Amino acid sequence: QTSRVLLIIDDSPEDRELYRRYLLRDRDHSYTVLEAGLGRRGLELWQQHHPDAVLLDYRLPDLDGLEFLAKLQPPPQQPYLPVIMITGQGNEAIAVQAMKAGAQDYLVKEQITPEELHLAVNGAIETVHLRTQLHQRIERERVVSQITQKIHQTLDLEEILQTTVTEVRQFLQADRVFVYRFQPDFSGIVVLESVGDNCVPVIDAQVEDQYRGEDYRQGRIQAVADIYTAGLTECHVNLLAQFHIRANLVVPILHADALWGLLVVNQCSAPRQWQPLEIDLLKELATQLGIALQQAELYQQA
């Protein structure tokens, strides 16, 4: 089977073949290798087939490796380049500029062993992952921290709610995020919504659906990757599909101990396996809303 897809860009065919053979010496992974001899073709292959790692030559006919890294645009989800510059025509200065341009590692051509190549590719892939994890931790901290500041400033509840749904949708890159407030009637209306183009907006287009909030009062969440494989009742499925909802993430909002409403995230383009980081964030945000809700009524009865 294929475990890793790797893109080699080098105007030397024999050099590409050498890497190809060395990679086969790796007993941990099986590499599928894309080859390109020109920088522009390398860009096309990268953009089209999303290799897990890139071996990038410095001196190429159409453009040098440094120009290449500058043109290389990383996908929103993981914005770091798994690129290893390998050159027989380079120095520590080019190495520094390569590292600055987004390369993860830098190798001299003559000294490359199979094992060195393996570890450089492993290191590049792992380092990109590491930077990505750190990148998201920072963004998650910013979102949570921003809401805390708004509560502390005693900003109106809906501004806090509007900021919440907007910022959490941008972070998750989801198609729709909305707050679903319950009434004393136990009826619920979508109070607030942040929606892209993949979803049918429901803020206005909405007639009431009724439910048993035993789980949501207990603080339990619903994490559905695919509405068609979650074993939902078909009526429930029909309703979600009617709004093109494919993946569903529901987090309960608790004011006092009463169930106030729901913090809901939707993917409408395709199914989506919700990740621990994403769920933990929504939970924290839900808790903060519960705080803001309590502050609101204490201020009102003052």
Ligand X SMILES: CCC1=C(C)/C(=C\C2=NC(=C\c3[nH]c(/C=C4\NC(=O)[C@H](C)[C@H]4CC)c(C)c3CCC(=O)O)/C(CCC(=O)O)=C2C)NC1=O
Q: Is 74 exposed, middle or buried (0-12, 13-18, 19+ CB in 10 A)?
A: middle
- Which residues contact its own copies by CB under 8 A? 91-93, 95-96, 99, 105-106, 108, 111, 113-116, 118-119, 122-123, 127, 130-131, 133-134, 137-138, 140-141, 144-145, 148-149, 151-152, 154, 254, 284, 287-288, 290-291, 294-295, 298-299, 301-302
Q: Is 189 exposed, middle or buried (0-12, 13-18, 19+ CB in 10 A)?
A: middle
11 near Mg ion, judged by CB under 5 A: yes
Among 20, 41, 59, 181, binds ligand BEF (CB under 6 A): 59
214 near ligand X, judged by CB under 6 A: no
Contacts with ligand X: how many residues (CB under 6 A)?
17
Taking the complex as a whole, the smallest distance from the CB of residue 57 to ligand BEF amounts, in Å, to 4
Q: Is 166 exposed, middle or buried (0-12, 13-18, 19+ CB in 10 A)?
A: middle
| C-beta separation of 262 from 180 below 8 A | yes
Q: Which is nearer to ligand BEF, 46 or 58 (CB)?
A: 58
DSSP one-letter code for 57: E
Question: Which helix H or strand E contains 241, and what residues bound it?
Answer: helix 234-242
Q: Which is nearer to ligand BEF, 31 or 58 (CB)?
A: 58
Residue listed under structure tokens 């062993």: 113
Hey, which residues does 262 pair with through a beta bridge? 180, 252
In this structure, the strands spanning 4-9 and 222-224 are: unpaired
Cα separation, 6 vs 226, in Å, equals 31
Cα separation, 83 vs 72, in Å, equals 10
Instruction: Select the binding partner of residue 260 from ligand BEF, its own copies, Mg ion, none (C-beta < 5 to 8 A, by kind).
Output: none
| C-beta separation of 122 from 135 below 8 A | no
Segment 88-147, which members bind ligand BEF (CB under 6 A)? 88-90, 109
165 near ligand X, judged by CB under 6 A: no
Taking the complex as a whole, the smallest distance from the CB of residue 206 to ligand X amounts, in Å, to 4
Binding track, positions 94-133, relative to Mg ion; x by CB under 5 A: -----------------------------x---x------
Q: Residue 192 is encoded by which pair of tokens?
A: 């607030």
Cα separation, 239 vs 207, in Å, equals 11
200 near ligand X, judged by CB under 6 A: no
Cα separation, 228 vs 238, in Å, equals 10
Instruction: Select the binding partner of residue 123 from Mg ion, ligand X, ligand BEF, none (C-beta < 5 to 8 A, by kind).
Output: Mg ion
59 near Mg ion, judged by CB under 5 A: yes
Beta-strand runs (E) in 11-82: 31-36, 53-57
Taking the complex as a whole, the smallest distance from the CB of residue 284 to its own copies amounts, in Å, to 6
180 near ligand X, judged by CB under 6 A: yes
Among 87, 97, 104, 194, binds ligand BEF (CB under 6 A): 87
Residue listed under structure tokens 């093109």: 244
Among 35, 52, 57, 175, binds Mg ion (CB under 5 A): 57
Cα separation, 4 vs 132, in Å, equals 19
Taking the complex as a whole, the smallest distance from the CB of residue 61 to ligand BEF amounts, in Å, to 9
Binding site for ligand X (CB under 6 A): 180, 190, 202, 206-207, 209, 211, 222, 233, 235-236, 239, 243, 248, 250, 262, 264
Binding site for ligand BEF (CB under 6 A): 57-59, 87-90, 109
